[PDB]
Amino acid sequence: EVQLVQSGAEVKKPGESLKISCKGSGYSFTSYWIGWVRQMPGKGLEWMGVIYPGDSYTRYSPSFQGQVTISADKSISTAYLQWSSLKASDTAMYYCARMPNWGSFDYWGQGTLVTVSSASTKGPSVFPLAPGGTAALGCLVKDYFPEPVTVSWNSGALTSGVHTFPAVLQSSGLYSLSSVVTVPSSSLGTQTYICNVNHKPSNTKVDKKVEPK
């Protein structure tokens, strides 16, 4: 019954201000601390700071002091984490968590994804990755923003041998990803292979038939 519900995904530009929230329920909000934890893409956990909502006592870890503001509104069981001026290096997943007086994080929020970038919403360009015993084919899903993209093969009918790779951030500030499938070499004449690429932020739904050549 204890729960921490965080605010929605944030896509921001550098220099913009930002305030994210964490609402508690199922327990006495003013009897526990609220911690804020940052997890940068592909990185470990970082303790940012804590607040006791009961009296607004706030403590920041040395690397986070003066970089971020932690606050609470106990009348609505909400704690906040804010930046006066975002940087691309602020791109991370941010968790709030409940902390009893003994210092561990017993209950966590679902997390809020914060993406900070100069870039604008851009749909991907889908290119074919054209083909012992096993043939590999795929689709290159290049130059999109923001994440995520979903990829399926043959409208979900092809699932075995499928690998959709984690996207990679190019120097351009655009994401790039590949999706591949392993097929028996004998099936390259009898079978049609289509990758279905979807990038919801730009309303792009593209079907690309991947032919050998």
């Binding site: 561990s104 994080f105 966590w108 997390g111």
Partner: peptide, 9 residues
């Protein structure tokens, strides 16, 4: 997924 507490103290 979010981290989950296993052991404390």
């Amino acid at each position: 997924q979010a981290p989950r507490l296993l052991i404390y103290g």
